[PDB]
Design a protein around this nucleic acid. Structure first.
Length: 73
DNA sequence: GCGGGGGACAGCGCGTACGTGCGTTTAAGCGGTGCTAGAGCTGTCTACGACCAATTGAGCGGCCTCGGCACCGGATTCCCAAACACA
């Protein structure tokens, strides 16, 4: 399954008012059996694609270093 | 021993400052010349310090006193850490 679903599912499972950090996303995908080490660069890209698709709102920071929430709009 | 909160450490981004490279300029390095100030050595003779015996008073041990400082309690003050006021 593509990493955009795994990320969206992790952000939905940890839904809050702040927003899953990249470190929490790493932890959730690793707990989901996804190798976050080798494919970290893929994650940053896929995450960026999800922000560029507007599917994730950046709530703090800039780019992948930030916190993110599912764009309910 | 325990609760917790701040700091250490991890991850990311970015932007500019440092490394690499190239061409030009500059002055370091080398050699060579010349000059003279001063370092190094020597002889003299003289004032200056070591040595010694005698004198003595300055300093050291021993005693004694009191005041400066330590201590205690009581009152004063000074940050602090919430804490709510209020925009």
């Amino acid at each position: 399954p593509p990493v955009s679903e795994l990320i969206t599912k992790a952000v939905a499972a940890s839904k809050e008012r702040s927003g899953v950090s990249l470190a929490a996303l790493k932890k959730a995908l690793a707990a989901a059996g996804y190798d976050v080490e080798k494919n970290n660069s893929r994650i940053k890209l896929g995450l960026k694609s999800l922000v560029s698709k507007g599917t994730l709102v950046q709530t703090k920071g800039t780019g992948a270093s930030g916190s993110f929430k599912l764009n309910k709009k």
